[PDB]
Coordinates of C-alpha atoms and ligand atoms in Angstrom, one line a residue:
Chain P
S1 CA 160.2 52.8 84.4
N2 CA 157.1 53.5 82.4
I3 CA 157.5 57.4 83.0
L4 CA 160.6 58.6 81.5
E5 CA 161.8 62.0 82.7
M6 CA 164.6 63.3 80.6
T7 CA 164.9 66.6 82.2
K8 CA 164.3 67.7 85.9
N9 CA 161.7 70.8 86.1
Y10 CA 163.6 74.1 86.0
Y11 CA 161.5 75.5 88.8
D12 CA 162.0 72.7 91.6
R13 CA 166.1 73.2 91.0
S14 CA 166.1 77.1 91.3
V15 CA 165.0 79.8 93.8
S16 CA 163.4 83.5 93.2
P17 CA 166.0 86.1 93.7
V18 CA 164.5 87.4 97.0
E19 CA 165.0 83.5 98.4
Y20 CA 168.6 83.5 97.0
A21 CA 169.0 87.2 98.6
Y22 CA 168.1 86.3 102.2
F23 CA 167.5 82.3 102.6
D24 CA 169.1 80.0 100.1
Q25 CA 172.1 80.4 97.6
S26 CA 172.6 76.6 96.9
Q27 CA 170.8 76.9 93.6
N28 CA 170.8 79.5 90.7
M29 CA 167.9 82.2 90.4
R30 CA 164.8 81.9 88.1
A31 CA 163.1 84.7 86.4
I32 CA 159.4 85.3 87.4
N33 CA 157.3 83.1 85.3
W34 CA 153.8 85.0 84.5
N35 CA 152.9 82.0 81.8
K36 CA 153.0 79.2 84.3
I37 CA 151.0 80.6 87.5
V38 CA 151.3 78.4 90.5
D39 CA 148.1 80.2 92.4
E40 CA 145.2 81.6 89.9
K41 CA 144.4 84.0 93.0
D42 CA 147.6 85.8 92.6
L43 CA 146.5 86.6 89.1
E44 CA 143.0 87.6 89.9
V45 CA 144.4 89.8 92.8
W46 CA 147.2 91.3 90.5
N47 CA 144.6 92.4 87.8
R48 CA 142.0 93.8 90.2
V49 CA 144.5 96.2 92.0
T50 CA 146.4 97.1 89.1
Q51 CA 143.0 97.9 87.1
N52 CA 141.7 99.8 90.3
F53 CA 144.9 102.1 89.9
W54 CA 144.0 105.7 90.9
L55 CA 145.8 109.1 92.2
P56 CA 144.1 111.6 94.4
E57 CA 144.3 114.1 91.7
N58 CA 141.4 112.4 89.9
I59 CA 138.9 113.8 92.6
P60 CA 137.8 117.3 92.7
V61 CA 138.2 117.9 96.5
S62 CA 137.8 121.6 95.7
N63 CA 134.2 121.0 95.6
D64 CA 134.2 120.1 99.2
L65 CA 135.1 123.7 100.2
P66 CA 131.4 125.0 100.9
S67 CA 130.4 122.0 103.3
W68 CA 134.0 122.2 105.0
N69 CA 133.5 125.9 105.5
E70 CA 130.3 124.7 107.2
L71 CA 132.1 122.7 109.8
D72 CA 133.0 124.4 113.3
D73 CA 136.8 124.9 113.9
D74 CA 136.8 122.2 116.6
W75 CA 135.4 119.7 113.8
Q76 CA 137.9 120.8 111.1
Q77 CA 140.7 120.1 113.8
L78 CA 139.4 116.8 114.2
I79 CA 139.2 115.6 110.8
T80 CA 143.0 117.1 109.9
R81 CA 144.0 115.1 113.3
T82 CA 142.2 111.9 112.3
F83 CA 143.5 112.0 108.7
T84 CA 147.0 112.4 109.8
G85 CA 146.8 109.6 112.0
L86 CA 145.7 107.4 109.2
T87 CA 148.7 109.1 107.2
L88 CA 150.8 107.7 109.9
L89 CA 149.5 104.2 109.7
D90 CA 149.5 104.2 105.8
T91 CA 153.5 105.5 106.1
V92 CA 154.0 102.4 108.5
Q93 CA 152.3 100.0 106.1
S94 CA 154.0 101.4 102.8
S95 CA 157.5 101.8 104.0
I96 CA 158.1 98.7 106.3
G97 CA 154.9 96.4 106.3
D98 CA 154.1 95.6 102.8
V99 CA 157.8 95.3 101.6
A100 CA 158.7 93.2 104.6
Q101 CA 156.1 90.5 103.3
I102 CA 158.0 90.3 99.9
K103 CA 160.5 87.9 101.1
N104 CA 158.0 85.7 102.9
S105 CA 155.8 85.1 99.8
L106 CA 154.6 81.7 98.9
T107 CA 154.5 82.7 95.2
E108 CA 156.7 84.6 92.5
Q109 CA 153.5 86.6 92.0
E110 CA 153.0 87.4 95.4
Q111 CA 156.2 89.4 95.6
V112 CA 155.1 91.7 92.8
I113 CA 151.7 92.2 94.5
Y114 CA 153.1 93.2 97.8
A115 CA 155.2 95.9 95.7
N116 CA 151.9 96.9 94.3
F117 CA 150.6 97.3 97.8
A118 CA 153.6 99.2 99.1
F119 CA 153.0 101.6 96.3
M120 CA 149.2 102.0 96.7
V121 CA 149.3 102.3 100.4
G122 CA 152.0 105.2 99.8
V123 CA 149.1 106.6 97.4
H124 CA 146.7 106.3 100.2
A125 CA 149.1 108.4 102.6
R126 CA 149.5 111.1 99.8
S127 CA 145.7 111.5 99.3
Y128 CA 145.2 112.9 102.7
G129 CA 147.9 115.5 101.6
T130 CA 145.9 116.3 98.5
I131 CA 143.1 116.8 100.9
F132 CA 144.8 118.9 103.4
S133 CA 146.4 121.0 100.5
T134 CA 142.9 122.1 99.2
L135 CA 140.8 122.4 102.7
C136 CA 143.3 123.1 105.4
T137 CA 145.4 126.0 106.5
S138 CA 149.1 125.6 107.0
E139 CA 148.5 126.1 110.8
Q140 CA 145.8 123.2 110.8
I141 CA 148.3 121.1 108.9
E142 CA 151.3 121.7 111.3
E143 CA 149.2 121.4 114.5
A144 CA 148.0 117.9 113.2
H145 CA 151.3 116.6 112.8
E146 CA 152.5 118.0 116.2
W147 CA 149.5 116.4 117.7
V148 CA 150.3 113.1 116.2
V149 CA 153.9 113.0 117.3
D150 CA 153.0 113.9 120.7
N151 CA 149.9 111.5 121.2
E152 CA 151.2 108.3 123.1
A153 CA 147.7 106.6 122.5
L154 CA 148.1 106.8 118.8
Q155 CA 151.7 105.9 118.8
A156 CA 151.2 102.8 120.8
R157 CA 149.4 101.2 117.9
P158 CA 152.0 101.2 115.2
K159 CA 154.7 100.8 117.8
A160 CA 153.0 97.2 118.7
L161 CA 152.8 95.9 115.2
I162 CA 156.3 97.2 113.9
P163 CA 158.4 94.4 115.8
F164 CA 156.6 91.7 114.0
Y165 CA 157.8 93.4 110.7
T166 CA 161.3 93.6 111.6
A167 CA 161.6 90.2 113.5
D168 CA 162.1 86.8 111.8
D169 CA 158.5 85.1 112.3
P170 CA 156.9 85.4 109.1
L171 CA 153.3 84.2 110.2
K172 CA 153.3 87.0 112.9
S173 CA 154.6 89.4 110.4
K174 CA 151.8 88.3 108.1
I175 CA 149.0 88.8 111.1
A176 CA 150.5 92.4 111.6
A177 CA 150.2 93.1 107.6
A178 CA 146.5 91.8 107.9
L179 CA 145.6 93.8 111.1
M180 CA 146.5 97.1 109.4
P181 CA 143.9 97.2 106.4
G182 CA 141.8 94.8 108.5
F183 CA 141.2 96.5 111.6
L184 CA 143.4 99.7 112.6
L185 CA 142.1 102.3 110.2
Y186 CA 138.3 101.6 110.4
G187 CA 138.2 103.8 113.9
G188 CA 139.5 106.7 111.8
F189 CA 137.2 105.9 108.6
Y190 CA 134.2 106.0 110.9
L191 CA 134.5 109.9 110.8
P192 CA 134.2 110.6 107.1
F193 CA 131.4 108.2 106.5
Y194 CA 129.6 109.7 109.8
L195 CA 130.2 113.3 107.8
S196 CA 129.2 112.0 104.5
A197 CA 125.9 110.3 105.8
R198 CA 124.9 113.9 107.1
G199 CA 125.6 115.2 103.4
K200 CA 129.2 116.9 104.2
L201 CA 132.4 116.4 102.5
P202 CA 131.1 114.0 99.6
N203 CA 134.3 114.5 97.4
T204 CA 136.4 113.5 100.4
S205 CA 134.5 110.4 100.8
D206 CA 135.0 109.6 97.3
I207 CA 138.7 109.3 98.1
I208 CA 138.0 107.1 101.2
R209 CA 136.0 104.7 99.2
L210 CA 139.0 104.4 96.7
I211 CA 141.6 103.9 99.9
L212 CA 139.0 101.2 101.0
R213 CA 138.4 99.3 97.5
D214 CA 142.3 98.7 97.9
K215 CA 142.2 98.1 101.6
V216 CA 139.6 95.3 101.6
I217 CA 141.6 93.3 98.9
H218 CA 144.9 93.8 100.9
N219 CA 143.3 92.3 104.2
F220 CA 141.8 89.4 102.1
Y221 CA 144.9 88.6 100.4
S222 CA 147.2 88.5 103.4
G223 CA 144.3 86.7 105.4
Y224 CA 144.4 84.1 102.3
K225 CA 148.1 83.3 102.4
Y226 CA 148.2 83.2 106.4
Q227 CA 145.6 80.5 106.0
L228 CA 147.6 78.6 103.2
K229 CA 150.7 78.8 105.6
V230 CA 149.3 78.0 108.9
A231 CA 147.3 75.0 107.4
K232 CA 150.7 73.1 106.9
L233 CA 151.7 73.3 110.7
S234 CA 150.8 70.5 113.4
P235 CA 147.5 70.9 115.1
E236 CA 149.6 72.0 118.5
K237 CA 151.4 74.8 116.2
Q238 CA 147.9 75.8 114.7
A239 CA 146.4 76.2 118.2
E240 CA 149.5 78.3 119.2
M241 CA 149.2 80.5 116.4
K242 CA 145.3 80.8 116.7
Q243 CA 146.1 81.9 120.5
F244 CA 148.6 84.4 119.2
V245 CA 146.1 86.1 116.7
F246 CA 143.5 86.4 119.6
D247 CA 146.0 87.7 122.2
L248 CA 147.3 90.5 119.5
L249 CA 143.9 91.5 118.3
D250 CA 142.7 91.6 122.1
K251 CA 145.9 94.0 122.7
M252 CA 145.1 96.1 119.9
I253 CA 141.5 96.5 120.6
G254 CA 142.5 97.8 123.9
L255 CA 145.0 100.2 122.4
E256 CA 142.3 101.3 119.8
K257 CA 139.6 101.9 122.2
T258 CA 142.0 104.1 124.5
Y259 CA 143.0 106.1 121.4
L260 CA 139.4 106.6 119.9
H261 CA 138.0 107.6 123.3
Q262 CA 140.8 110.2 123.5
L263 CA 140.2 111.1 119.6
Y264 CA 136.1 111.2 119.9
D265 CA 134.7 111.5 123.5
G266 CA 134.4 115.2 123.5
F267 CA 132.5 115.1 120.2
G268 CA 130.1 112.0 121.4
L269 CA 131.1 109.7 118.7
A270 CA 133.6 107.2 120.4
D271 CA 130.8 104.5 121.4
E272 CA 129.7 104.5 117.7
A273 CA 133.5 104.6 116.2
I274 CA 134.4 101.5 118.6
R275 CA 131.4 99.6 117.5
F276 CA 132.4 100.3 113.8
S277 CA 135.9 99.1 114.9
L278 CA 135.0 96.0 116.4
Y279 CA 132.4 94.9 113.4
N280 CA 135.9 95.3 111.1
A281 CA 137.8 93.3 114.2
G282 CA 135.2 90.4 113.3
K283 CA 135.6 90.5 109.5
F284 CA 139.4 90.6 110.3
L285 CA 139.0 87.4 112.3
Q286 CA 136.9 85.8 109.6
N287 CA 139.5 86.6 106.9
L288 CA 142.1 84.6 108.9
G289 CA 139.7 81.5 108.9
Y290 CA 138.5 82.2 112.4
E291 CA 135.2 82.9 114.3
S292 CA 134.0 86.2 115.2
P293 CA 133.7 86.3 119.3
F294 CA 131.8 89.9 119.1
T295 CA 128.2 90.4 119.9
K296 CA 125.6 91.9 117.8
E297 CA 125.1 94.8 120.4
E298 CA 128.9 95.8 120.5
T299 CA 129.1 95.6 116.6
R300 CA 126.0 97.5 115.6
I301 CA 126.6 100.2 112.9
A302 CA 124.0 103.0 111.8
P303 CA 122.3 101.8 108.3
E304 CA 123.4 105.4 106.7
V305 CA 127.1 104.7 107.9
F306 CA 127.0 101.0 106.4
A307 CA 125.4 102.6 103.2
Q308 CA 128.4 105.0 102.8
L309 CA 130.8 102.0 103.6
Chain W
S1 CA 169.7 134.0 126.1
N2 CA 168.7 136.1 123.0
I3 CA 168.6 132.7 121.0
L4 CA 166.9 130.2 123.4
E5 CA 164.3 127.7 121.7
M6 CA 161.0 127.5 123.8
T7 CA 159.2 125.8 120.8
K8 CA 161.1 122.6 118.9
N9 CA 159.4 122.0 115.6
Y10 CA 157.7 118.4 115.4
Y11 CA 159.8 117.2 112.4
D12 CA 163.6 117.6 114.1
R13 CA 162.2 116.0 117.4
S14 CA 160.4 112.8 115.5
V15 CA 161.5 110.0 113.0
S16 CA 159.8 108.5 109.8
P17 CA 158.5 104.9 110.7
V18 CA 161.1 103.2 108.6
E19 CA 164.0 105.2 110.8
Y20 CA 162.0 104.0 114.2
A21 CA 161.8 100.2 112.6
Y22 CA 165.7 99.9 111.7
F23 CA 167.7 102.5 113.4
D24 CA 166.3 104.5 116.4
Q25 CA 163.3 103.7 118.7
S26 CA 164.1 106.7 121.2
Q27 CA 161.9 109.2 119.2
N28 CA 157.9 109.2 118.3
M29 CA 156.9 108.6 114.6
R30 CA 155.9 111.4 112.2
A31 CA 153.4 110.8 109.3
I32 CA 154.8 111.8 106.0
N33 CA 154.0 115.7 105.2
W34 CA 153.4 116.1 101.6
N35 CA 152.2 119.5 102.4
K36 CA 155.8 120.8 103.6
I37 CA 158.1 119.0 101.0
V38 CA 162.1 119.2 101.9
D39 CA 163.1 118.4 98.4
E40 CA 160.9 119.7 95.3
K41 CA 163.0 117.1 93.0
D42 CA 161.0 114.2 95.1
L43 CA 157.4 115.9 94.0
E44 CA 158.7 116.2 90.2
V45 CA 159.8 112.7 90.3
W46 CA 156.7 111.5 92.0
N47 CA 154.5 113.3 89.7
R48 CA 156.3 112.2 86.4
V49 CA 156.7 108.2 87.4
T50 CA 152.7 108.2 88.6
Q51 CA 151.7 110.1 85.6
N52 CA 153.6 107.7 83.4
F53 CA 151.6 104.5 84.9
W54 CA 151.1 101.7 82.2
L55 CA 150.3 98.1 81.9
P56 CA 151.6 95.8 79.1
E57 CA 147.6 95.0 78.5
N58 CA 147.8 98.5 76.7
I59 CA 149.9 97.4 73.9
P60 CA 148.5 95.1 70.9
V61 CA 151.5 92.9 71.0
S62 CA 149.3 90.4 68.8
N63 CA 150.0 92.9 65.9
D64 CA 153.5 91.6 65.9
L65 CA 152.6 88.0 65.1
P66 CA 153.2 88.5 61.3
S67 CA 157.0 89.8 61.7
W68 CA 157.4 87.2 64.6
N69 CA 156.4 84.4 62.1
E70 CA 159.0 85.8 59.6
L71 CA 161.8 84.9 62.2
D72 CA 163.1 81.1 62.2
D73 CA 163.3 79.0 65.4
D74 CA 166.9 80.4 66.3
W75 CA 165.9 84.0 66.3
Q76 CA 162.4 83.5 68.2
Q77 CA 165.0 81.2 70.7
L78 CA 167.1 84.3 71.0
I79 CA 164.6 87.0 71.9
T80 CA 162.6 84.5 74.3
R81 CA 166.0 83.8 76.1
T82 CA 167.2 87.5 76.0
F83 CA 163.9 88.7 77.6
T84 CA 163.6 86.0 80.3
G85 CA 167.3 87.2 81.0
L86 CA 165.7 90.6 81.3
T87 CA 162.8 89.3 83.4
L88 CA 165.4 87.8 85.9
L89 CA 167.3 91.2 86.4
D90 CA 163.7 93.1 86.6
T91 CA 162.6 90.5 89.4
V92 CA 166.0 91.1 91.3
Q93 CA 165.4 94.9 91.3
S94 CA 161.5 94.9 92.1
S95 CA 161.7 92.2 94.9
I96 CA 165.4 93.3 96.7
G97 CA 167.0 96.3 95.1
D98 CA 164.2 99.0 95.2
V99 CA 162.8 97.7 98.6
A100 CA 166.3 97.9 100.1
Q101 CA 166.4 101.7 99.0
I102 CA 163.5 102.4 101.4
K103 CA 165.2 102.6 104.7
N104 CA 168.3 104.7 103.5
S105 CA 166.0 107.7 102.0
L106 CA 167.1 111.2 102.6
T107 CA 163.6 112.4 102.7
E108 CA 160.0 111.2 103.4
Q109 CA 158.8 111.3 99.7
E110 CA 161.8 109.2 98.6
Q111 CA 160.5 106.1 100.6
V112 CA 157.0 106.1 98.6
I113 CA 159.1 106.7 95.2
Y114 CA 161.3 103.6 95.8
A115 CA 157.9 101.6 96.6
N116 CA 156.5 103.0 93.2
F117 CA 159.9 102.0 91.3
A118 CA 160.0 98.1 93.0
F119 CA 156.0 97.9 91.5
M120 CA 156.8 99.4 88.1
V121 CA 159.9 97.1 87.6
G122 CA 157.6 94.6 88.7
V123 CA 155.4 95.6 85.8
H124 CA 158.6 95.7 83.4
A125 CA 159.3 91.9 84.3
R126 CA 155.4 91.2 83.9
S127 CA 155.4 92.8 80.3
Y128 CA 157.8 90.1 79.1
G129 CA 155.2 87.5 80.2
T130 CA 152.5 89.4 78.0
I131 CA 154.9 89.5 75.1
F132 CA 155.7 85.6 75.4
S133 CA 151.7 84.8 76.1
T134 CA 151.1 86.4 72.7
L135 CA 154.0 85.2 70.5
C136 CA 155.7 82.0 72.1
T137 CA 155.0 78.2 72.3
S138 CA 154.9 76.8 75.9
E139 CA 158.0 74.9 74.8
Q140 CA 159.6 78.2 73.9
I141 CA 158.9 79.8 77.2
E142 CA 160.1 76.6 79.5
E143 CA 163.3 76.2 77.3
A144 CA 163.9 80.0 78.2
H145 CA 163.7 79.7 81.9
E146 CA 165.9 76.2 82.0
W147 CA 168.5 78.3 79.9
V148 CA 168.5 81.3 82.5
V149 CA 168.9 79.0 85.5
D150 CA 171.8 77.0 83.8
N151 CA 173.4 80.2 82.3
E152 CA 176.5 80.9 84.6
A153 CA 177.7 84.1 82.6
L154 CA 174.1 85.3 82.8
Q155 CA 173.7 84.5 86.8
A156 CA 177.1 86.1 87.5
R157 CA 175.7 89.8 86.9
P158 CA 172.8 89.7 89.5
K159 CA 174.8 87.7 91.8
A160 CA 177.4 90.5 91.8
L161 CA 174.9 93.2 92.8
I162 CA 172.5 91.3 95.3
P163 CA 175.4 91.5 98.1
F164 CA 175.2 95.2 98.0
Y165 CA 171.7 95.4 98.6
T166 CA 171.5 92.9 101.7
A167 CA 174.7 94.7 103.2
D168 CA 174.8 97.7 105.5
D169 CA 176.7 100.1 103.4
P170 CA 173.8 102.5 101.8
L171 CA 175.9 104.1 99.3
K172 CA 177.3 100.9 97.7
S173 CA 173.5 99.9 97.8
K174 CA 172.6 103.0 96.1
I175 CA 175.3 102.7 93.3
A176 CA 174.0 98.8 92.7
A177 CA 170.4 100.4 92.3
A178 CA 171.6 103.0 89.7
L179 CA 173.6 100.3 87.9
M180 CA 170.7 98.1 87.2
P181 CA 168.5 100.8 85.1
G182 CA 171.6 102.7 84.2
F183 CA 173.8 100.0 82.4
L184 CA 172.8 96.5 83.0
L185 CA 169.9 95.8 80.7
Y186 CA 170.9 97.8 77.6
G187 CA 172.9 94.8 76.2
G188 CA 169.4 93.1 75.9
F189 CA 167.4 96.2 74.9
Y190 CA 169.8 96.2 71.7
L191 CA 168.1 93.1 70.3
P192 CA 164.4 94.7 70.1
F193 CA 165.5 97.8 68.6
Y194 CA 168.0 96.3 66.0
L195 CA 164.9 94.3 65.0
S196 CA 162.5 97.2 64.9
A197 CA 164.8 99.5 63.0
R198 CA 164.1 96.8 60.3
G199 CA 160.3 96.8 60.9
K200 CA 160.1 93.6 63.0
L201 CA 158.4 93.4 66.3
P202 CA 157.3 97.1 66.5
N203 CA 154.7 96.6 69.1
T204 CA 157.3 94.8 71.3
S205 CA 159.6 97.9 70.8
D206 CA 156.6 100.0 72.3
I207 CA 156.6 98.0 75.3
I208 CA 160.6 98.3 75.6
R209 CA 160.2 102.2 75.2
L210 CA 157.5 102.3 78.0
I211 CA 160.0 100.1 80.3
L212 CA 162.9 102.8 79.2
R213 CA 160.5 105.8 80.0
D214 CA 160.6 104.4 83.9
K215 CA 164.5 103.2 83.7
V216 CA 165.9 106.6 82.9
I217 CA 163.9 108.3 85.8
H218 CA 164.9 105.5 88.1
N219 CA 168.8 105.9 87.0
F220 CA 168.5 109.8 87.2
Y221 CA 166.8 109.5 90.8
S222 CA 169.1 107.0 92.1
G223 CA 172.2 108.9 90.8
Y224 CA 170.7 112.4 92.0
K225 CA 170.4 110.8 95.7
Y226 CA 174.0 109.4 95.5
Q227 CA 175.4 112.8 94.6
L228 CA 173.4 114.5 97.7
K229 CA 174.9 111.8 100.1
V230 CA 178.5 111.5 98.6
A231 CA 178.7 115.2 99.1
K232 CA 178.3 114.6 102.8
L233 CA 181.9 112.5 103.0
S234 CA 185.2 113.8 103.8
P235 CA 187.2 114.4 100.5
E236 CA 189.3 111.4 101.2
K237 CA 186.1 109.2 101.5
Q238 CA 184.6 110.9 98.5
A239 CA 187.9 109.7 96.4
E240 CA 187.4 106.3 97.9
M241 CA 183.8 106.0 96.7
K242 CA 184.5 107.4 93.3
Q243 CA 187.3 104.5 92.8
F244 CA 184.5 101.9 94.1
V245 CA 182.1 103.2 91.4
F246 CA 184.8 103.0 88.6
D247 CA 186.0 99.6 90.0
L248 CA 182.4 97.9 90.3
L249 CA 181.4 99.3 87.0
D250 CA 184.7 97.8 85.2
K251 CA 183.9 94.4 87.1
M252 CA 180.3 94.7 85.6
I253 CA 181.5 95.7 82.2
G254 CA 183.6 92.5 82.3
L255 CA 180.7 90.2 83.3
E256 CA 178.2 91.8 80.8
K257 CA 181.0 91.6 77.7
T258 CA 181.2 87.8 78.7
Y259 CA 177.3 87.2 78.6
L260 CA 176.5 89.4 75.5
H261 CA 179.6 87.5 73.4
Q262 CA 177.8 83.8 74.7
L263 CA 174.2 85.5 73.8
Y264 CA 174.8 87.1 70.5
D265 CA 178.3 86.0 69.0
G266 CA 176.5 83.4 66.9
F267 CA 174.0 86.1 65.4
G268 CA 176.8 88.7 64.8
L269 CA 175.1 91.1 67.4
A270 CA 178.0 91.1 70.1
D271 CA 180.2 93.7 69.2
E272 CA 177.3 96.2 68.4
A273 CA 175.4 95.2 71.5
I274 CA 178.5 95.8 73.7
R275 CA 179.2 99.5 72.1
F276 CA 175.5 100.1 73.0
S277 CA 175.9 98.9 76.6
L278 CA 179.1 101.1 77.0
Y279 CA 177.2 104.0 75.8
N280 CA 174.9 103.6 78.6
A281 CA 177.8 102.8 81.2
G282 CA 178.9 106.4 79.9
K283 CA 175.4 107.9 80.9
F284 CA 175.3 105.8 84.1
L285 CA 178.6 107.5 85.3
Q286 CA 177.3 111.0 84.0
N287 CA 174.2 110.2 86.4
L288 CA 176.4 109.8 89.2
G289 CA 178.2 113.2 88.6
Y290 CA 181.4 111.6 87.0
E291 CA 183.0 112.1 83.4
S292 CA 182.5 109.1 80.8
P293 CA 186.0 107.7 80.2
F294 CA 184.8 105.8 77.0
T295 CA 185.7 107.1 73.1
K296 CA 183.0 108.0 70.5
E297 CA 184.5 104.5 68.5
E298 CA 183.9 102.4 71.6
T299 CA 180.1 103.6 72.2
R300 CA 179.1 103.9 68.4
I301 CA 175.3 103.2 67.9
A302 CA 173.7 102.8 64.4
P303 CA 171.6 105.8 63.9
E304 CA 168.5 103.7 62.8
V305 CA 169.1 101.9 66.1
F306 CA 169.4 105.2 68.1
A307 CA 166.2 106.5 66.4
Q308 CA 164.4 103.4 68.2
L309 CA 166.0 104.2 71.3
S310 CA 165.3 108.2 71.6
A311 CA 161.7 107.8 70.1
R312 CA 159.2 108.9 72.9
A313 CA 156.6 106.3 74.3
Ligands
CL1 CL1 147.1 98.9 104.5
CL2 CL1 148.6 96.1 102.9
CL3 CL1 165.4 99.2 86.8
CL4 CL1 165.2 101.1 90.0
CU1_5 CU1 146.8 97.9 102.5
CU1_6 CU1 164.4 100.8 87.6

């Protein structure tokens, strides 16, 4: 043999601890190796999300009190309800969705990045608390929580995704994980961007932009990992998974439209919020490596809302 | 009829998502409420660990190159091996241990705090990589990974804890979760502090102190939550769980002693490393609400080493 291999590489005869815990005990465990990185995209994402660390205490929400006080009681209630709705989706993602992805990682660094995502989506949920602490009465806060618990249209959306997280199909779990930052919160994010475009709650929209700076990377990353895994399947299994993605998005769009109509119809924002939602549904499909089937007309966003985005 | 409830509060007729996911789908989900906090200890812990956010890039490890170059290949190999061993334990805790705690939380905020722990223990593991990048050859780094995979005494320790994380007993899972930051890494932390007490690798010891600033809160918090849950058991079942804690710690001390003898005997550090380990075994039990059964002599630490430990980050 012209190539003498005296030792066998440690990496190919060991498993990460999470693999050992849940899947394969046939070999000993390897420590994470940050010196020999399998996918440089992992290091790029790790560096960006850790460099982007923030806490809601960094933003002076107190400065929004004047513009908040200009808003009628029904608008204040709409914002508190919408944001408590987004708090629920962040609680789902932080406590179930992100941590479920860790054991299904392609790489060692991916396990640590999803730990960062779980923590930072927790910070997202905590930030709404900070906004409420500054702007809302105890009565407004308590009412919003009651409204969320009793809103069947709102509950339907996380109830549809959670089963994919707790089941044993890692690709369907990954699609659910991408759908949360990629699609489900944009219907809600429409409201602060609408308000900011008209000069209301500027400091609140600064928190929303810090949340979105994280969520756009979360969607990209989960989509990137989905694409690497699905590419290794047969043409038939790739066709079945593409069908599953479109079928699940179709269902979630149906549930989102029902919820957004209920949330916004009284205010005249439902049509605009749904177009904003469908635009992001298109970007969600693109980040999974599929083509958007959505029309220019049904995805149209006002320039000044896009500007806030 | 004086006491009839006409209005049921949202909290007591809903569940957190993680409860809905793993335990009960009969009730609708509530969003986390940071405006009405059940346990003020959760907010204090959240505020401290988030305020204590750090990255290993923050510490100029390259300033250790002079003192690193003074150490012979045997000492450099010992440090790379020990630290890759600590990297393995941090990987176990970040990817399995902390994650496993979330669904067993007593409060909403506890679910988010364990997400923070999973991330920050990930940062701990990443910090050894930063030290290696700066100080070690590619040969030293690869050798240490091979050594960790093939070291049965090293492997035995995490292999003993992982089953508690993957099993359905949340109190045993919690004890394991406290044992990792409370006890299992201190045998390894002895080495950097031994060296920095003699003015070697001072910047490395700053990284270890930033890691310890997190791990002491992790141990306290998991111990605090253990004590709240064990208090809800019958006195009979409280006695059983106390016996399990002492039996598990006894077993883990056995495995740690074997590993530290194998790691250090050649460098004459084994006895002092084990004393340092048992000192922290004592602190671990105290944080679970039990008395340390260890003597002053069994737990003696040289004052110059204790000065490196107790020094604030
Ligand atoms: Cl998200
Ligand atoms: Cl995410
Ligand atoms: Cl730890
Ligand atoms: Cl921990
Ligand atoms: Cu996210
Ligand atoms: Cu820890």
